[PDB]
Amino acid sequence: MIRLYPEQLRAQLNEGLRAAYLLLGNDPLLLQESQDAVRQVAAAQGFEEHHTFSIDPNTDWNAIFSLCQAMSLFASRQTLLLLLPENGPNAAINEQLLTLTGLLHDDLLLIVRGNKLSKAQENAAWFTALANRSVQVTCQTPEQAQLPRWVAARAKQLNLELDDAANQVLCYCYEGNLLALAQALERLSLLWPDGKLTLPRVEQAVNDAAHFTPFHWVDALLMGKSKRALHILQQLRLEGSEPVILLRTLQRELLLLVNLKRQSAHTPLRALFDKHRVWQNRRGMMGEALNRLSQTQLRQAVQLLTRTELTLKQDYGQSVWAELEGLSLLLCHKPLAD
């Protein structure tokens, strides 16, 4: 299985077509790109019929299994596209795939797609099969160091002069959801055809664009002054956010916060962060919180969240926002006793 990057794919495709193509990674567009890059050469061969079946334990597998079991009377062929689960091929699916691993024939091109595979999942009978015929195309979101480079490269193919500083800002918001970044680019292509994206030009478009993730709220709450926090909240309403999703998002970060503070003298803040593995830059920020939130401030914040969560689901629609507001203010100043 020739392992290679999206970029070498077009080159490899040329030399010939291989039994099956494994698109593994989390990036929305590379997967897409690599995908269409494949089919573009298949229909270009004799593959008119194209199929796509998602892997979730609740699928209708007889349909699938028997659709490839059949050789065609008119040699018409097909392109089977399996959509791997979100979590990926569990134990029962290490076989379900091992089965379709010895059926392939030069007139049934296989293209599996999902997020990368774990060292374990990459030994599950099935993968080890394609292990000779196939090819895998690593599709992963570039890191913090190449993140901006990507935006620079790509931009350049969209015939764009995106300044470094204008590149940075963009890279700091939507820091990661490659999806949007790819978007805001073709959009900006549109604002200024034959224009330049100086820092003043992009920074405003982005500033005014004013989109806040409830993640933005939380992060503020991360000891950041309440001002922005509260604003991002009422803004986060006029973005028709559901309150249920705000609650549990802060939870993850508020609970995480309890442990960490709980583990002082357990292990230096350092070692700990890795351990939980959310520490992506948030480390400085998480730390900063863990310096002003008292063991008790935490709890209070946890009792409230609960009241909210509960009060949210027991009188279904008592305008929770009220409480959320108070809540945030709690995570920003010393507290009292009621």
Partner 1 sequence: YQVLARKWRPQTFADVVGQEHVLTALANGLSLGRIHHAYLFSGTRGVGKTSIARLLAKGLNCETGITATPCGVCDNCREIEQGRFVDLIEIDAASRTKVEDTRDLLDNVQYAPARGRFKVYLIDEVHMLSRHSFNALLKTLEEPPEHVKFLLATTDPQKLPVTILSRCLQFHLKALDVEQIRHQLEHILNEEHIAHEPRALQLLARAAEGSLRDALSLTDQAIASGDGQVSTQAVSAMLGTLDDDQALSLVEAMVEANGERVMALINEAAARGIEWEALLVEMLGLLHRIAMVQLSPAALGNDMAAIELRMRELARTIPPTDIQLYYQTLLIGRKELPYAPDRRMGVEMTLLRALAFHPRMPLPEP
Partner 2 sequence: MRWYPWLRPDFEKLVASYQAGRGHHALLIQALPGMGDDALIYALSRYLLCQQPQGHKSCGHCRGCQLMQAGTHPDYYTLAPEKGKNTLGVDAVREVTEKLNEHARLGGAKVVWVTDAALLTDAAANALLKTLEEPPAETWFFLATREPERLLATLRSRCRLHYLAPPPEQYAVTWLSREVTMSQDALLAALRLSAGSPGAALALFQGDNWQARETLCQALAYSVPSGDWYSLLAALNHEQAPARLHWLATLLMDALKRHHGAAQVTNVDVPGLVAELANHLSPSRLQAILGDVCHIREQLMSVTGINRELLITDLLLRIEHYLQPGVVLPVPHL
> Would you count residue 234 as binding partner 1 (CB under 8 A)?
yes
- Hey, what are 148's tokens? 């901006």
Q: What are phi and psi of 80, to 5 degrees?
A: -80, 125
Q: Quick check: helix, strand or coil at residue 65?
A: helix
The only residue of 8, 234, 303, 318 in contact with partner 2, by rule CB under 8 A: 303
Residue 183 touches which member of partner 2, partner 1, none, C-beta under 5-8 Å by kind: partner 1
Q: Which is nearer to partner 1, 70 or 190 (CB)?
A: 190
Q: Quick check: helix, strand or coil at residue 178?
A: helix
Q: Which is nearer to partner 2, 84 or 312 (CB)?
A: 312
List of residues 6+ apart from 21 with CB closer than 8 A: 34, 38, 109, 110, 111, 112, 134, 135, 136, 137
The only residue of 96, 167, 226, 308 in contact with partner 1, by rule CB under 8 A: 226
**83-110 b/e (C-beta count within 10 Å ≥ 16 → b):** ebeeebbeeebbebbeebbeebeeebbb
**C-alpha torsion sign, points 293, 296, 297, 301:** positive
The only residue of 4, 12, 17, 32 in contact with partner 1, by rule CB under 8 A: 32
> Would you count residue 256 as binding partner 2 (CB under 8 A)?
no
> Would you count residue 84 as binding partner 1 (CB under 8 A)?
no
> Would you count residue 210 as binding partner 1 (CB under 8 A)?
yes
Quote the DSSP letter at residue 71: P
> Would you count residue 183 as binding partner 1 (CB under 8 A)?
yes
Q: Which is nearer to partner 2, 165 or 255 (CB)?
A: 255
> Would you count residue 29 as binding partner 1 (CB under 8 A)?
yes
Residues lying near partner 2 in the complex (CB under 8 A): 248, 251, 255, 258, 262, 298-299, 302-303, 305-306, 309-310, 313-314
